[PDB]
Amino acid sequence: NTEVSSEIYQWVRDELKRAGISQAVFARVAFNRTQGLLSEILRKEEDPKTASQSLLVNLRAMQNFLQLPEAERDRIYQDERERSLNAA
Numbered sequence: 001n002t003e004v005s006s007e008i009y010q011w012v013r014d015e016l017k018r019a020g021i022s023q024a025v026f027a028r029v030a031f032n033r034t035q036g037l038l039s040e041i042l043r044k045e046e047d048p049k050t051a052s053q054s055l056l057v058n059l060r061a062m063q064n065f066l067q068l069p070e071a072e073r074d075r076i077y078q079d080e081r082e083r084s085l086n087a088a
Contacts (some may be wrong), residue, residue: 004048008059012042013068020078029076031061 027038035086041058048056063075 004056004063006047007044008048008063008066009045012038012062015066019073019077025077025080027062029073030065031058047074 008061012026012030016023019026023038024035030038032034037058046055048059051059
């Protein structure tokens with residue numbers, strides 16, 4: 001109804017295939033922490049019902065990001081090279 005369901009994992013797969021970006025990006029914008037973790041979380045696909053504390057927090061952040069408007073995600077997905085260097 002309004003709880004953390006398996007849809008969270010399915011959303012990430014759909015968002016990644018729809019948007020068309022690397023895991024490093026979606027992982028940095030979804031839940032900044034450490035690369036490679038998203039792989040283990042997606043591989044197991046364990047439901048929050050039988051998930052750990054650290055796991056529940058991961059899906060919680062991913063949900064808020066997916067719930068946010070596309071306009072916001074677009075600005076985040078685009079803005080990557082904030083420190084755009086210059087050629088002398």
